[PDB]
Design a protein around this ligand. Sequence first.
Ligand SMILES: CC#CCn1cc(N(CC2CC2)c2nc(C(N)=O)c(-c3cc(C(=O)N(C)C)c[nH]3)s2)cn1
Length: 296
Amino acid sequence: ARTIVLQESIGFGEVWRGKWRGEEVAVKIFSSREERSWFREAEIYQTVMLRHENILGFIAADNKDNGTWTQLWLVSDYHEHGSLFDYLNRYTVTVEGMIKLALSTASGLAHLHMEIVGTQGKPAIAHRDLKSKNILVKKNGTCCIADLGLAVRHDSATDTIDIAPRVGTKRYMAPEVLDDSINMKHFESFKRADIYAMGLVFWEIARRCSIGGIHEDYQLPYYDLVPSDPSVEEMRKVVCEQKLRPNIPNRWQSCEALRVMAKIMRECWYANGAARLTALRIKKTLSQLSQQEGIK
Ligand SMILES: CC#CCn1cc(N(CC2CC2)c2nc(C(N)=O)c(-c3cc(C(=O)N(C)C)c[nH]3)s2)cn1
């Protein structure tokens, strides 16, 4: 923190583009009264064997005293494209482009979800706030997952969670979170809730897949059913009571890649978390799709 110069506001806490010896970094800055949120996110990022090409690259947790108040810093790799939300608003994608964004997101989530067993292993982690606004797009057109502050970690020996857990973004909350039926002592239930949210993100990507000049406008999931900044009650009435999901355009049946993406979405969107695909199964499916004749 001592040797980083903040240059530009780029969106708990606030995010800046900084320079460390002339190299661009991203800095999320918290106030003294946000220490618990800063510490918890620092803790998640310092998890043994967390580093992965599809998880935002951690550089440091640090303090900076400006002479009046102390700032709490989280420093990461800088990605010029910023959030998948901003990227999908600005650009359309090719079939290959769509699969790369979806596969890289699934690979990041499969890694978070995966317990790497050992005396020195990585615990399984559930994100609990996955959305297009906290996935970043790298220069190579792959995604990495950020904003890990609400994550929960699994102790597989006792089947317990490392903290005492409706915390995340209301629009992306799983049906079982919206109606508060989720078993918050059951780690597997948090993994299944992440899959529902990733299905919504896949729908946002697929809309922007342009074939023969044809694509949908960028929209958030449920743009057609709830107000901007929706309440838990507004979301619950649509997702749980009326049992609606984002609409699958008829266009997506014209293309094998979009057909497979649409099938993944419906198998992420079941009301019962136990019925949903795993991140690893989605990663396997999109890996196979990426190499298919007519796609590759
Ligand atoms: C460990 C750690 C850490 C730091 N950290 C940083 C974030 N967030 C916020 C985001 C996840 C919600 C971000 N990171 C980056 C980045 N890495 O380039 C962001 C970015 C925005 C733009 C951009 O929009 N423009 C226009 C340059 C370009 N890049 S926005 C969260 N935590």
